[PDB]
DNA sequence: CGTTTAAGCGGTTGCTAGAGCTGTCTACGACCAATTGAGCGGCCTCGGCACCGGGATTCTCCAGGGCGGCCGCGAAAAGGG
């Protein structure tokens, strides 16, 4: 997935889309419950790989 | 201490250097007036060093393309009742 969009070719069309949704998920996530202290976020229960 | 030798003193004999005195004069330096150009201060400008803007040149990083390994998953061959 590349496109141009102001004589800048090559550029990632989709990884410009994700980025901007899941930084706007981690900033809205963190503000929520952790706006005192950013330091502690947890993950909870959720198991990565 | 023994021995030789040269300093010290007195003497010759003539000429010349030098101090002292007297005399003349002449070039040379003090002195004065007019003049001006070489010394001291400032003013202006260039040679060279340095500061700043602009352009050419080479090094570093982020992302895409391709390949390997796992994850159970699922179709399929063989065995049992």
């Known amino acids: 997935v590349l ?4 004589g ?3 550029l990632n069309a989709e990884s ?3 980025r ?3 930084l706007k998920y981690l900033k809205n996530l963190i503000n ?3 706006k ?3 330091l502690k976020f ?4 959720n ?3």
């Open 8 to 10: 800048v070719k090559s």
């Open 36 to 38: 005192d202290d950013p």
């Open 3 to 6: 496109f141009n969009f102001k």
């Open 16 to 18: 410009l889309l994700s």
């Open 42 to 45: 947890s993950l909870g229960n």
């Open 47 to 49: 198991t990565p790989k």
């Open 32 to 34: 929520s419950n952790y």
């Open 20 to 22: 901007v949704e899941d």
